[PDB]
Amino acid sequence: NLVETTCKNTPNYQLCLKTLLSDKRSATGDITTLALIMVDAIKAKANQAAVTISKLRHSNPPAAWKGPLKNCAFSYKVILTASLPEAIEALTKGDPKFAEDGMVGSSGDAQECEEYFKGSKSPFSALNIAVHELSDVGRAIVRNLL
């Protein structure tokens, strides 16, 4: 019952469980594999956010959203091109401290994104919240190895 036990040691059991059991690798999965499955979930959501940000920026958004959008674009670019790749590298290399830092970064960047839309509607709030939730679950999985 590693998936059960692992997901119990996360800040969101039901999300962890739903996510790991979607993936085929979970049934035969050690802690690192489960980390690896979470990263790929974060990546799916981050790719969606990246496109969604781009669309909005191309849809003649109100001026007040230009700042937030532009900053969010940078956030997801870092997540996609640096944070997540380095986590996959680190988990592969057997160096989890560096994969925890990927999960910490992606969580803060998604949260910082949401935060720019404070006091207004947030046009892709669910995607920010998903990247943060999923990231906070990956970080917990990763910390079993520290």
CA distance 36 to 21: 13
CA distance 113 to 21: 29
Distance, C-alpha 23 to centroid of its chain: 16
Is residue 31 a contact partner of residue 6, using CB atoms and an 8 Å limit? yes
CA distance 118 to 141: 30
The tokens describing 69, both together, are 């959008």
Q: Give the DSSP letter string of 83-138.
A: IHHHHHHHHHHT-HHHHHHHHHHHHHHHHHHHHHTTTS--TTHHHHHHHHHHHHHH
CA distance 109 to 127: 12
CA distance 99 to 69: 27
- Comparing C-alpha atoms, which of 93, 91, 112 is closest to residue 36? 91
Q: Resolution of this entry in Å? A: 2.0
- Degrees (nearest 5) of the Cα angle 137, 139, 144? 100
CA-CA-CA-CA dihedral for 113, 114, 118, 122, to nearest 10: 120
Distance, C-alpha 43 to centroid of its chain: 6
**Which residues are annotated binding-site positions for beta-D-fructose?**
95, 97
Q: What residue has token string 């790719």?
A: 47
Q: What is the DSSP letter of 62?
A: -
CATH code of the domain in which 72 resides: 1.20.140.40
Method by which this entry was solved: X-ray
Residue numbers of the domain that contains 121: 1-146
Domain tally, the chain = 1
The tokens describing 77, both together, are 């670019």
4, 5, 7, 52, 100 from 27: Cα distances, Å: 11, 13, 13, 33, 23
**Which residues are annotated binding-site positions?**
95, 97
Is residue 38 a contact partner of residue 17, using CB atoms and an 8 Å limit? no
Q: What is the DSSP letter of 65?
A: G
